[PDB]
């Protein structure tokens, strides 16, 4: 959720995460999850950046500019990933940055 | 004179020679070689894309999945999904399904 400089409040959706099983005992134990994230970035322009991802093409979007509408394809960066209780704990506290 | 005696007995290879430090003399750190480093964040950074709705809700209010469906319902022009960049080590049709 964010507030524009114009004052408008807004709710944003970047994608989805699918949590696996999570019988986390030790603080290093892993939850597997899948992250499905929108993007306009073409992965082929920098394929070494996306070793772990499987990038899909899922739609097309009409985008405003100054005085012209552009047609861009919509990608979905998909990957399996993991985290732990200790890493989640420290992510929850990232405001101290 | 126990310390002085043994200090006379000890080899003069046991020493701490001061080598003066000039940062004009010294070299740059060696960075390794190998395949390129991949992205490893838990979520996309600069490559992220948002679907959003205008919403007076505050910085953590509303049912997440209800909010999510509201954001999805702003975008049409979805497509039949196709793989445009494989996860070389993965069964990519699982990601598609």
């Amino acid at each position: 959720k964010c507030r524009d400089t114009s004052g408008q409040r807004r709710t944003n959706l970047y994608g989805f995460i699918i949590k696996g099983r999570s019988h986390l005992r030790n603080d290093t134990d892993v939850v597997n999850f899948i992250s499905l994230e929108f993007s306009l970035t073409d992965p082929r322009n920098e394929i070494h950046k996306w070793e772990k991802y499987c990038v899909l093409e899922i739609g097309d979007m009409e985008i405003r500019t100054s005085i012209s509408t552009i047609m861009k394809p919509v990608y979905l960066y998909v990957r399996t990933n993991g985290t732990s209780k200790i890493k989640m704990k420290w992510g929850m506290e990232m405001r101290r940055c | 004179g126990n310390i002085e005696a043994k200090l006379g007995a000890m080899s003069e290879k046991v020493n701490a020679q001061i080598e003066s430090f000039d940062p004009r003399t010294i070299r740059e750190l060696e960075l390794p070689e190998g395949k390129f480093c991949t992205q490893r964040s838990k979520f996309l950074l600069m490559d992220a894309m948002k679907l959003s709705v205008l919403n007076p809700a505050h910085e953590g209010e509303g049912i997440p999945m209800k909010d999510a469906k509201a954001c999805l319902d702003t975008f049409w022009g979805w497509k039949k999904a196709t793989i445009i960049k494989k996860h070389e080590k993965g069964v990519n049709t699982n990601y598609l399904m």
Partner: peptide
């Protein structure tokens, strides 16, 4: 630039 790839106007 021309548009925002993170906050596209659609």
């Amino acid at each position: 630039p021309s548009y925002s790839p993170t906050s596209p106007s659609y």
